[PDB]
Design a protein around this ligand. Sequence first.
Ligand SMILES: [Cl-]
Ligand SMILES: [Cl-]
Ligand SMILES: [Mg+2]
Ligand SMILES: [Mg+2]
Ligand SMILES: [Mg+2]
Ligand SMILES: [Mg+2]
Ligand SMILES: [Mg+2]
Lengths: 191, 191, 204, 222, 222, 233, 233, 212, 222
Amino acid sequence: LKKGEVSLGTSIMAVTFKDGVILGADSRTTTGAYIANRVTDKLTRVHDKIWCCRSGSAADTQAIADIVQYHLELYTSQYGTPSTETAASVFKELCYENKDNLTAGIIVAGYDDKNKGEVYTIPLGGSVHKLPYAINFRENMSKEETVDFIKHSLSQAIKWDGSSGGVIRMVVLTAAGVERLIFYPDEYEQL
Amino acid sequence: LKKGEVSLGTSIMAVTFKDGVILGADSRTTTGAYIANRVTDKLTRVHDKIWCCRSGSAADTQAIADIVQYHLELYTSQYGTPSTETAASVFKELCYENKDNLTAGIIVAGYDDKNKGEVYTIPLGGSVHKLPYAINFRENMSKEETVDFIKHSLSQAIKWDGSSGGVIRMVVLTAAGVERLIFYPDEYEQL
Amino acid sequence: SDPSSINGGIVVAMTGKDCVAIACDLRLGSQSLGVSNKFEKIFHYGHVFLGITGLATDVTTLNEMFRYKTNLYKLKEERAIEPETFTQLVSSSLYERRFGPYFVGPVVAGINSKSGKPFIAGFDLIGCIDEAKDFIVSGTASDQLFGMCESLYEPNLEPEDLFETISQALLNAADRDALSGWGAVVYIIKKDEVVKRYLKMRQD
Amino acid sequence: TTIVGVKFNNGVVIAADTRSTQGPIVADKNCAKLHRISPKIWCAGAGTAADTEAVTQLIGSNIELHSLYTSREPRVVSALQMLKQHLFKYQGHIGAYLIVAGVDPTGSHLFSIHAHGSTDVGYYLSLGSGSLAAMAVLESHWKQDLTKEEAIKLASDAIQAGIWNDLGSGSNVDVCVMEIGKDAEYLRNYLTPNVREEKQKSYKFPRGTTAVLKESIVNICD
Amino acid sequence: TTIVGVKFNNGVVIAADTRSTQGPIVADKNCAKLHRISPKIWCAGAGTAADTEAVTQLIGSNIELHSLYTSREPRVVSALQMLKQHLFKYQGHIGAYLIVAGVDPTGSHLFSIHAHGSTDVGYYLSLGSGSLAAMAVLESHWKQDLTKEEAIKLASDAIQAGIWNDLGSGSNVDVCVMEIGKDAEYLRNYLTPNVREEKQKSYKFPRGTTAVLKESIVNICD
Amino acid sequence: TQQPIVTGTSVISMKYDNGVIIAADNLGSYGSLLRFNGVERLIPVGDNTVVGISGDISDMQHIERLLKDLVTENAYDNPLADAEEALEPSYIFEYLATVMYQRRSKMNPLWNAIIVAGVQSNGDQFLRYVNLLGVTYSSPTLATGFGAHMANPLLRKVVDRESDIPKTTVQVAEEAIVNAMRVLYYRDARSSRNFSLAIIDKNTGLTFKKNLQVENMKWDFAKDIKGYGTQKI
Amino acid sequence: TQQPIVTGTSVISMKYDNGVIIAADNLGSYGSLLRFNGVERLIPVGDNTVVGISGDISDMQHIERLLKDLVTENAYDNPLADAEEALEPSYIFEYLATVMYQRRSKMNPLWNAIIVAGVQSNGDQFLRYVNLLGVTYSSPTLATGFGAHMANPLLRKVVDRESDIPKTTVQVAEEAIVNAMRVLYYRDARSSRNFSLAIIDKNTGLTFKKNLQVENMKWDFAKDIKGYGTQKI
Amino acid sequence: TTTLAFRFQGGIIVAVDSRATAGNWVASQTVKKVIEINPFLLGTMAGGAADCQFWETWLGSQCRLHELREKERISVAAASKILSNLVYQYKGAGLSMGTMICGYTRKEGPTIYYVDSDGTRLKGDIFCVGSGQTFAYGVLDSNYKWDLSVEDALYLGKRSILAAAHRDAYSGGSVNLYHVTEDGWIYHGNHDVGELFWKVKEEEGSFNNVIG
Amino acid sequence: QFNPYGDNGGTILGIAGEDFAVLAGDTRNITDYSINSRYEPKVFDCGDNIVMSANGFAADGDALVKRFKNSVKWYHFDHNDKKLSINSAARNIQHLLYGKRFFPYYVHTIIAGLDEDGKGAVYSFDPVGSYEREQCRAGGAAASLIMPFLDNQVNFKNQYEPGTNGKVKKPLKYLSVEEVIKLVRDSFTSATERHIQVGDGLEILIVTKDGVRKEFYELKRD
Ligand SMILES: [Cl-]
Ligand SMILES: [Cl-]
Ligand SMILES: [Mg+2]
Ligand SMILES: [Mg+2]
Ligand SMILES: [Mg+2]
Ligand SMILES: [Mg+2]
Ligand SMILES: [Mg+2]
């Protein structure tokens, strides 16, 4: 991580559930002890129903996410809608081949109609790991339970970590469509 | 922390409850990635009903604990049984004045008949902090609940931290007396 | 800037049958430059012999020291010091300077005047005693000496045979070391006579 | 170095190898790593050889004086405490890694001490460059309620693991058994599995081979 | 430097101070930190002065050519993207910290760009050595649904906070207002609260004071 | 030579017409971790002085004991310890400032930034700063750490110079302080929502307020913010 | 030039009379954190080879792809791809060992330690090691990382030399491997209880065992241990 | 290492030692430090063994190609310059070389060029290179004359190496002599320093400091 | 930082006779204090009656041997199956080694065979390609222990004729293959005693006009 460059902390998560998948994150962005942005959107769209959670270098994760979005737009034009696995592969390919110059930790989450909700995590090294969730979870939770799980989890991260704070943003990916959720400090702090 | 010296990890806790106080810890001790001792006793007696939890440098914490035990033995001979607050003060006095040469994180826990169960934490800097517990807890828990709270908490620390492992040792401090508890991997892992 | 390899030199000691031998080269240099071909590294205090390799100033200093200490030992004890006792004195004296050591590799050799047993010993710079039946090596060509001694040496050699073995161990070791050589001396020590021979070796 | 300690029924046993290195060079092929602190308290030492001997002799001296002062047989905890406090004072600069064991009026004890001043308690312990090879054996074969003969076997097997598999350890196996109500028995060279084979040739020189410049008689007498 | 950007009802406004430092020395007391990228897209820049001008002119050039090629008015997102990709490519070595704002057929926009290539979206932003002084003001007084006149006030107040309290910022306040359906109005020296007071004395020298060795006429003509 | 471990962030303060105000959050951070949430960093000395301390917490607890021991020592053989020969802010300050400079001159500093706020016996306001280097200064507004960058600019809008002090009321001053503390919560990564505030008035004396919270925050506008540039959804 | 991030620890293996055994735990560590618990570090290539990899996980996943792509490429224009001209362990090894040495010679290594275990077409056992430096060696027992220090000594008690291989059965070999894995769980801080094990036999072929656990552990003696020396309670 | 080469009435004398060291360890005592570039040209080895061997062998190949193309013996000037221009290309990369390129032609007469890995190319009458160069220079300077006989000149070169071999720890083994004439070079044998020292001591009366 | 080199230990030895030549080397491969293999050959038959060993960093040694073997193969193709003389192979290896002058093979290389007159030949190389023909040469970790012994026994250095006042040297002479193998075996058993990296086994490759023969001998495993 370069000196003085904008950091995205590391409080992000994606959880699969019955109807699909939910991405969640805080909104804090730092430069040392200074909060450069307190209403950041770390949940980024690479395709209609494939989103990602960004951590580490803000510059690096933005540049990558932008490139991935380019590749999936071009993929879709030629070969039709891509899989969440395909999206994770492109992310990895970038994060792995440029591991010396990057500081990007990415969680890829998406919704297919065949594969349903999928979650892939891509840590610093450039490795890929398919999981049920990423950061007493159970499989096939309801939307309302998964929201409370992400809410309670990030709430605690914010409580103990100074690199985390602000609002809790969440994106719900289902066959119904895409739903954005937000939760303010007065709500989650006193949980 | 000196290079190659024995590290005590950091998975220790003390929790106050209705009848008194309980100290808890793992049993792992490392030298790099090598586990030097897997059945360590990090719960040490400085007085009949004043115990401590040691973290950081094993050599440093042992030398301090030994000195504290000396001071409280001499205190008792002259001025009668000391308070848990007094014990924490002696620890602090050592950890604070020799902060440049030490790497010791200590949790002091004891049982008076007036003050009941008390917990004091002494981090690296040499500061003292009196707390209800130290490392979703409720005040005035039962013995059985507090045991399950420590058990579940350390169990997770062991699960995710490689500096932690082995057995979970616990010491119960009450008006009844002193009780030693132990919990093996087959029990706590599958919680 | 390695004190043990500025001046250079070697010492080797061997046991035989009712005899011991100790030998040293004669070089003293300042790194590449050869300065003296008469710098003997073996000293004796009564019937106990001491060879010292390493930094020359410490070699000279320690000799003067053990001369000092053995002379007083004799005045008080009213008898000369034995090899086993002297060995412990050397170890004591060296570890006294544990955190500011003399850069030396001493070797003790002699025969016990009471029991008649041959005795040799070696030390590191902080006084770890290496007692040995066979042989002891010290110096800049210690690796070389270890190779020569380990192959050439055999037990219970007679004085006249032991002489040839230790002389050949030293000479051929010294010739594969740039900082050792320029002359050699061998002490053959029997219970009540000691012969000292200067060897002829290549002077390069 | 490879040193171990094993507790058994009525006592404790410690063992060690006999190699002393100087980088990649073997300085001593049969060195004694087992030290006597008191008659029934023995210490196995690894690390800096001069430090393990110097520290074990100093504490042994002070233990002897203490034993005379108190009119009592020395305790292992006394040796343990005096050692760790000395080592701690020098902050690891005295590179002594020790396994202390013995019997006293309180019972049989086994401890380890690291150069920095930390002590550990156990039924089986191992220290040195071959401690991992040895501990692999101990973790595989150790059990509760060992007999004297079972413990000596386990100990010497653990040391062998180091001799063969660790380059810093070699030569022979030394053992010392400290049993309760008995004199401690020091078994020097209990095992000698590394005997040098016969040489193919005798390199004894013909007399006169060596060239000589001068001869003289040295006067050692007064 | 102190630069800000504030969104309002029908547009966006950016402001900046006018001091240019060279260590502790003020090189320029009235420098222009507001840059024109396109007619209705303006950029406030902090950091390395040569870099903020060079990067804003290059992207402005490429935006003009793009506007001619596409027969369309340029967009802020186009400037934003071209800038961040250029800055990212040079890994922060081009020390340009920018606040980009403007109006296009899509609406009114406000962004910030850091030297490393990260962009941020907001209703109010501040960058530079006086960004903390300015943000303190913005966080205290900003609200949703500002008017043009309220936004210019908030912006110039935020810059003033930097002028007074930050040593790296000073002199005057520049503003540019970009409103929808209107021409962008560049308010150079909108505020001049640091006018130098009259000197106590005139240091105009008597003619002939200066000693002279030679004189000659220089030929500038052909 | 040290390095701080558990630290406390900004301490902000200002003068008003009849006295001084001082505030500081209840947090003890560990690098990036918000570990201790029950830390009081404002310490009253008598009924006329409050010392606010930022920096290393263990060194802060050392200074607490010095001040506590100072009060005890002043009462020795002193019949006027609760009157004429009671401790003044200027005495307490000069003591600490002496200690801080001595410690830095021994290359073993107390890793702190201190603000002594109080009211003198003659009714004059006292507000002075001292840090680990032994550097001292006084001003109508004083702040440590971030407070110096974010709070001072806000407080100086109220009291930009000495002549503005008589014009500033306690209600206005307290409002500026409480606003500043909210801004620091927004923008300081090492801050907390909970804080303490103290007022030393020449008429009403020392008022000490604990368990305060930052409130009336603005977060609603966050929902409209999407992506980092081009993203519409 | 790299630095590894998410890593995998020891890989242990040994030869027996009819084949080879290889094992490795299912963990991906991150400095000190036991983050990924579903990591398979044993990768079968065909029905006669298993490559066990320790070190950087991302570089391991790269090597997985290479081997997978090697099998595909070998089947091209090859009617005997499932018979005579099928991939051998010695082919697969030499490929990787070539790659590993090329990468270190470009100062951009694959931060791994690899053990290729398999059985050749003529029934011979294959067991060879290669690491990030391109260093290769073969032995009756091979291990990486900690396994080299703790496992090899145990496995060499079973097969101390080449002549002991025909005397060693699969039941004995598997027991030594499973014992070694328990010892590593006791003493390696970067290890897990869960692991995978593979056997390549010249008669019964490739047997791949997943979701194994270390069991029959000794922990009871811990209760008798109190303090660090003098403490009796 | 000690290498010397000097011009005189009868051509050029080249004399070198034979020792190679890796730290204090004496790797070899039988090293050939004179490179026979061709029958008419010699080169000395000092600095890097491989650098001197490789590139002075390469030089011989370039000299052979010159005389094939030009039908004339290459000058010492031209031969030396081919080498110096080559090592100058590699300047900074870390080559280590200190050599004397020696030859005797019609147009030049006996000629010596000191060539060096940082690009230096010097023509001269007497050159000495190596760890023991200073010892050899002393004997050379005090005894050198242009009108030396071939017999006396050969001994002077031999005696100068011996002086270095004695004092310099990193010089010794044996002495190799060469005499370079217009018709080519003539080898004058290998002389063990051990035997040579005692011989010279007795016959010359020098080295009284040493007991023999 | 990534260190591309390592030390795999081991030691090698090449002696040349009248009508034969031997190249020996221990079979132990090590890293630090661990043993990797007790039998890992590093002396190879490269064809045309040439044997070769590249001791030091095994990865570089294996690559060099592999390249030379391939160099022999292409020499046959390009030059009508001509036999590669030992002197031609030596010069070829110089070019292989020096071709990596600025990123060397960390190996001490020795080759043995017969020259074009049928006499025994041994060539030794430094890591960057300087080479020299010799009667006797040890290489690797324990070269310092072995080599002065060879000087004494093969080349009869420092040995003078008895009775001659150290005036007449002991005369040089060729040794038999049987006497040479004794010196090799005794060289390696002595080195095994005093060097920790040397042991396990000894493999000797003998080269005569008839071909290449092998001989193996056990060594101590500690
Ligand atoms: Cl961002
Ligand atoms: Cl401990
Ligand atoms: Mg664990
Ligand atoms: Mg020499
Ligand atoms: Mg200013
Ligand atoms: Mg010399
Ligand atoms: Mg060996």
